[PDB]
Amino acid sequence: EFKKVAKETAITLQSYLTYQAVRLISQQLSETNPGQAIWLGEFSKRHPIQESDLYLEAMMLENKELVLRILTVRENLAEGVLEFLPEMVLSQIKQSNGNHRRSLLER
Amino acid sequence: FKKVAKETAITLQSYLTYQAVRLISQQLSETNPGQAIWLGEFSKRHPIQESDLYLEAMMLENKELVLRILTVRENLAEGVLEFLPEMVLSQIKQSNGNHRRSLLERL
Numbered sequence: 001e002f003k004k005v006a007k008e009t010a011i012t013l014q015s016y017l018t019y020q021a022v023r024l025i026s027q028q029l030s031e032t033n034p035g036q037a038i039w040l041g042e043f044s045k046r047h048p049i050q051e052s053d054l055y056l057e058a059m060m061l062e063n064k065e066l067v068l069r070i071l072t073v074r075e076n077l078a079e080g081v082l083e084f085l086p087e088m089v090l091s092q093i094k095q096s097n098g099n100h101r102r103s104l105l106e107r
Numbered sequence: 108f109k110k111v112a113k114e115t116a117i118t119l120q121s122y123l124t125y126q127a128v129r130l131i132s133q134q135l136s137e138t139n140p141g142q143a144i145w146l147g148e149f150s151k152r153h154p155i156q157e158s159d160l161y162l163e164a165m166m167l168e169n170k171e172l173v174l175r176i177l178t179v180r181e182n183l184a185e186g187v188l189e190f191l192p193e194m195v196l197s198q199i200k201q202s203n204g205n206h207r208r209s210l211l212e213r214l
Contacts, residue, residue: 017199
């Protein structure tokens with residue numbers, strides 16, 4: 001149960017950081033190769049990013065450069081961002097909890 | 108990578124909320140099935156992805172539960188956050204590893 005939550009949250013995160021990496025490569029490409037940009041928005045239609053491994057495995061058939069870029073960018077975001085997540089989220093949850101508690105125990 | 112961190116922490120905050128609602132939903136299916144059904148179709152009306160809007164909407168309907176979610180989401184966060192950066196960083200490196208190897212050796 002703590003185990004099931006952790007394992008599910010990590011999968012979610014790995015998936016989300018893939019999504020962030022595609023968003024980031026999309027800004028880059030919209031400024032440099034808008035061909036391949038309109039393209040990527042369209043590939044994202046036929047395949048849900050939420051299934052990250054299936055999204056990449058499917059892309060591999062169509063556009064091998066762009067997969068490798070995605071794997072590189074997602075790892076960079078991961079190394080930059082992950083270790084900051086516990087303070088920020090734990091701290092945000094306290095601020096949020098506090099606001100909602102007040103809004104409920106003032107009405 | 109700060110905008111990515113902020114957007115990642117908010118997704119994470121909201122995901123731990125979801126996960127809190129999932130545990131509370133399991134307890135209710137046992138002790139109070141009427142609420143469990145309620146909570147189920149509440150969750151189809153208000154997307155948990157927007158955590159604060161969801162607790163705010165729920166406030167008009169069931170305030171005991173909102174308070175319960177907050178408590179539970181904080182416990183979960185305190186329990187599970189410290190574990191996440193290693194798991195995500197390690198799953199990604201491992202996953203990059205298989206996709207790279209599949210692409211390069213197999214074509």
